[PDB]
Amino acid sequence: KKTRHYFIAAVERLWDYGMSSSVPQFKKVVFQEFTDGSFTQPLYRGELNEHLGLLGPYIRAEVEDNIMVTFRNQASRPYSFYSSLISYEEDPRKNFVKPNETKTYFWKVQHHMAPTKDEFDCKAWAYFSDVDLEKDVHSGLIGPLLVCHTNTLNPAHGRQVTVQEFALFFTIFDETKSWYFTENTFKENYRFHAINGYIMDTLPGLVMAQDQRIRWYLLSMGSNENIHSIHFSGHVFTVRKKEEYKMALYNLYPGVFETVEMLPSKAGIWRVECLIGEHLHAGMSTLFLVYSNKCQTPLGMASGHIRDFQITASGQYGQWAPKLARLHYSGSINAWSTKEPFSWIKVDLLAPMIIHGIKTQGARQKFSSLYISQFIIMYSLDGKKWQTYRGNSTGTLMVFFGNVDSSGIKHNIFNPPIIARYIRLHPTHYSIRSTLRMELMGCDLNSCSMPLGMESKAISDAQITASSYFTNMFATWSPSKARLHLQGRSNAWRPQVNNPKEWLQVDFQKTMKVTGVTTQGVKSLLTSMYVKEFLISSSQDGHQWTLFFQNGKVKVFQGNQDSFTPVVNSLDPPLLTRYLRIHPQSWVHQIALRMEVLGCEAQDLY
């Protein structure tokens, strides 16, 4: 069993919560995760622990283990380390560390500082400077220090692994305290109702799956007001203590670090708030996304659904542009490439989105393997100030592996999943030119942009009929053939006569939330038939249809241009329903429809 070793220091920063949709300074002090004894590199905080915020880092350990925290006061005033557990030797009694000074504390974890067989796989414990047990908090020094059961933390790979851990900490930050009374007495203002130091909605980092159970490490701290009654909207938890108890609200007293586990409900973007009125409309709300990852789906660099703009380069080699950068682009006139040294390429997904993985590619030249070899990823959720991706516990940032040939097709998954509007890919090694075809794998925010079954045959056969259909002694263009990919004998729906006020009808079994529809044509050895333009009516009851308007507009949808090519329309307000019905207005040679539906499960019934 191991010696955990932590290079931690105490740093001075600016603090703010000058949001994301004028603004105040504040020299606060924090615990900073450093790197070698030199305290030269600080350890870049990855997507992993983005949420810690104002906290210093997770100091983790198993029980039979040792902890060693070599600590450096890179600050202005004297501070200390101190937790409870931090146990000494024996025969002038105690300590603090002066500025520009290093102290070391090393001690064996006992079962006396661990979780009982009855608790949870880990227990959280608090650490903070005890130079002024009161002021050296408001100033900014607290972190969590987790003791875990043996064989629970994963070797080398950082710590734990099979549950996502998150540590929330609720205080009033009152900068009348804080050794830092610089400044830019009258009567009152600076009370921050902060969760890991983020007032109103600021706390940025709660990305978590709709499977993995989460344990949340909860802490309050100080002023006898700090009695924060914590709620997790539409979610419950369990508590350790004697036996396991199920609860929906847990009250924090000062100092009581509390470990609770939960398995999250339905996917989406929810809140955690201190339910005591005043305390809330003072800033406690803070959000978390539970995404599904049974929703990975192509972001549409496949089909030109990501239109020819919204893809940029650092530069390019002649023509051989990005744009031509889509996965599978054919011809040898294809894919982005520069021989310029350190290039990059960027997609505006034109909207905030979860992106689970990128698929990468090369290109033949004459007889010249042309592929991107190694690369890293950057991304932004706004546009201006960017970010680098360090997937799970790695080191400095996560290095990806591209192709090793002109057509091989690496699909690197975003382990923890990137959460951006924009995504930028910079090459680090290459074949002979950094060359790239690629598709993005992702899904919208709310995890609800998925195939609804038409193509899946997931939607039943006679779960669809239409306003009539063509059929004769030979063919049968049954409505039940309107299936996005279906290769068949006569393979699509077609009505018998061609009518402007014609339709095809899908009965969703239950009530479904719709993102949009992907439409299609057919070839009949005859000619290409497709629908050019169309309208959606929806119902609810079976016979009472209220057609899809857009904003006074009766939304006139933008259909295909060929036999093949799935072309897809999003929905203005996403459409809750049981009854869907596209309405071919003007077509090409015939009305002909293959098609699928996009979306998922809503308030099923009333």
């Binding site: 557990l85 931090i86 146990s87 000494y88 030797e89 024996e90 025969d91 009694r93 105690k94 006992q110 006396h112 500082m113 661990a114 009982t116 009855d118 608790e119 608090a126 002024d132 047990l133 006898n224 700090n226 009654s229 709620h231 909207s233 419950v236 350790r240 203590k241 004697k242 036996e243 396991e244 108890y245 199920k246 609860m247 929906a248 609200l249 009250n251 007293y253 000062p254 100092g255 009581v256 670090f257 398995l263 339905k266 809140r271 339910l275 005591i276 009125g277 005043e278 809330l280 409309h281 959000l287 925010l445 709310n446 307000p573 996403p574 809750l576 809503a602 308030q603 019934l605 009333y606």
Partner: protein
């Protein structure tokens, strides 16, 4: 497996000559109207909604108010067109209609109750939660929008009819009336103030269950007691319920003895604020090794007291020299008090030795279930004082019941200066620890001739009721400002005491001694042998108004089979802990309240090697 509730959000008019606001309610209509006959005591409380662990509740809200209001349930799940709260659903309006129902606005909700949302293996039969308006909280709570929401295992009054348990819904509400749509202040129990609220009845032999909801807008806390009677939470004997900010807990009473009993809130400044009502208990018809006698002779005794012994910090330089270092108008350090001292026999001269360890406290009363204490108490001192213990329930004078002379209860009966009285404190499992309980619960004994003068004058000591199978820390603030002796002390400790003034900004502080065991300012140290392992019976008592957060520098203690960092002490609770204690050095045991702990209020703890 399905439960529709026709709920509506009406503004009516409150009280039992004052106040009037908007709150929840029943109705039976299909379109809008009257229909919902509501029972006595669910005061203003929105109707109690109640489902099982597979059922689906379907509240159809009507909002009849001029208020914009919602319907936010806690502890049950839904999609994002129930929940009824507005942030970043991100969703379309048929998905944000729940979030804020506008005045005149009917919109329906749906909650389900998955194997998940339901009550754990070994907790309660129904978990206590509740619902509310989540659109201005402070606006909405305070006006009257909170219904009781109960989630429940497979057995229930709408499936499994013979659930015949006796159960009320206690809502301990601090309603601010100037934070309403007031454009002032009630402070109740179910909407009933001072002590109306009829309901409250339990059957003599059997037991009674409370679904408790703490509610308020702000962190102001409570300590609820029910006369004579103790509680069950989780599974621990708790003799107070301790209601916080916003607290759903679910608790049991079991009422022997017929009568009427007040429950209420012990904390000081709430006394008149009138959160309290009566519970009665008359008989329903149903089908119409061998224990010891623990004996002590205890006395009330006027000694002088030194709050900070060997330790001076000379010069009025300080902020401590000011509580201690006596001055032109500050008694400081040394006051005349009246403690319990323990003597040897029927006569009272000569006793067992004073406690550097457990300072001001009277002697340690102990007794196991079955056991009987036997308190012969003499009062040597100038005021009628007495002894009652809190925790225990069987306290009669020794040879009879019929409590002497006039007094309808013994706690109030005063022992005259110079008389002796013989008391039998018999102990019974039903006021002692359970299997879950830290098997040896801490408690205290005092003088109820003037609940707190008689305490804040010097009269306490500790009491341990323990199971039928020592280190006492007491966190006390003594307000010498009203000792009974205050006056006497002044005419003896001060520049010939003319210019008096009891009331006085700064001076008044000089006499408020913040103390562990009657010792202040890192005076009182404790020795222990490193490795020697200890039970510590800690209690805040007479440490006026607030809660505590006790410390122990560099030490972890087992509070109720779990390992902790810092224990939390309400008013007149006393919690009992365990020191796996092999960590050497000088450790500053104070409290990580840093308000108090430099008004005095810390001790030191030395851990080092011995030789038994």
């Amino acid at each position: 497996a399905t439960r529709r509730y026709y709920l509506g959000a009406v503004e009516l008019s409150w009280d039992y000559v004052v106040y009037k606001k908007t709150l929840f309610v029943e109705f039976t209509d299909h379109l809008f109207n009257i229909a919902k006959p509501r029972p006595p005591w669910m005061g203003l409380l929105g109707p109690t909604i109640q489902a099982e662990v597979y059922d689906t509740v379907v509240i159809t809200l009507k909002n009849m108010a001029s208020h914009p209001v919602s319907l936010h349930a806690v502890g049950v799940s839904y999609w994002k067109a129930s929940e009824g709260a507005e942030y970043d659903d991100q969703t379309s309006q048929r998905e944000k209609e729940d979030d804020k129902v506008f005045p005149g606005g009917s919109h329906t909700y749906v909650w389900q109750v998955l194997k998940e949302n339901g009550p754990m293996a070994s907790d309660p039969l129904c978990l206590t939660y509740s619902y509310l308006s989540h659109v201005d909280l402070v606006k909405d709570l305070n006006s009257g929008l909170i219904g009781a929401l109960l989630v429940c295992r497979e057995g229930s009054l709408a499936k499994e009819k013979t659930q015949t348990l006796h159960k009320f819904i206690l809502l301990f509400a601090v309603f601010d009336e100037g934070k309403s749509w007031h454009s002032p202040k009630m402070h109740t129990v179910n909407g009933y103030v001072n002590r109306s609220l009829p309901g409250l009845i339990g059957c003599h032999r059997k037991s009674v269950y409370w679904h408790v909801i703490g509610m308020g807008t702000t962190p102001e806390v409570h300590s609820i007691f029910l006369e004579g009677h103790t509680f069950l939470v989780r599974n621990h004997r708790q003799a107070s319920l301790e209601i916080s900010p916003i607290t759903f807990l679910t608790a049991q009473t079991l009422l022997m003895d017929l009568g009427q009993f007040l429950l209420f809130c012990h904390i000081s400044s709430h006394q008149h604020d009138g959160m309290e009502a009566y519970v009665k208990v008359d008989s329903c018809p149903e089908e119409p090794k061998h224990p010891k006698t623990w004996v002590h002779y205890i006395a009330a005794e006027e000694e002088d007291w030194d709050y900070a012994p060997l330790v001076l910090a000379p010069d009025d330089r300080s902020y401590k020299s000011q509580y201690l270092n006596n001055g032109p108008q500050r008694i400081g350090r040394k006051y005349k008090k009246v403690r319990f001292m323990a003597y040897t026999d029927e006569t009272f001269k000569t006793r067992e030795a004073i406690q550097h360890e457990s300072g001001i406290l009277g002697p340690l009363l102990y007794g196991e279930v079955g056991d009987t204490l036997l308190i012969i108490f003499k009062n040597q001192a100038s005021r009628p004082y007495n002894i009652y213990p809190h925790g225990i329930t069987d306290v009669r004078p020794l040879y009879s019941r019929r409590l002497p002379k006039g007094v309808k209860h013994l706690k109030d009966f005063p022992i005259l200066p110079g008389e002796i009285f013989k008391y039998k404190w018999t102990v019974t499992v039903e006021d002692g620890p359970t299997k879950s309980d830290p098997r040896c619960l801490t408690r205290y004994y005092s003088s109820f001739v003037n609940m707190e003068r008689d305490l804040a004058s010097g009269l306490i000591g500790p009491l341990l009721i323990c199971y039928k199978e020592r280190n006492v820390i007491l966190f006390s603030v003594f307000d010498e400002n009203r000792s009974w002796y205050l006056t006497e002390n002044i005419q003896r400790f001060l520049p010939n005491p003319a210019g008096v003034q009891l009331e006085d900004p700064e001076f008044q502080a000089s006499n408020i001694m913040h103390s562990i065991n009657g010792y202040v300012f890192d005076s009182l140290q404790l020795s222990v042998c490193l490795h020697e392992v200890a039970y510590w019976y800690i209690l805040s008592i007479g440490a006026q108004t607030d809660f505590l957060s006790v410390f122990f520098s560099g030490y972890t203690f087992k509070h109720k089979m779990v390992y902790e960092d810092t224990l939390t002490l309400f008013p007149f609770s006393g919690e009992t802990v365990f020191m796996s204690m092999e960590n050497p050095g000088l450790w500053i045991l104070g409290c990580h309240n840093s308000d108090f702990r430099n008004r005095g209020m810390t001790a030191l703890l030395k851990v080092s090697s011995c030789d038994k």
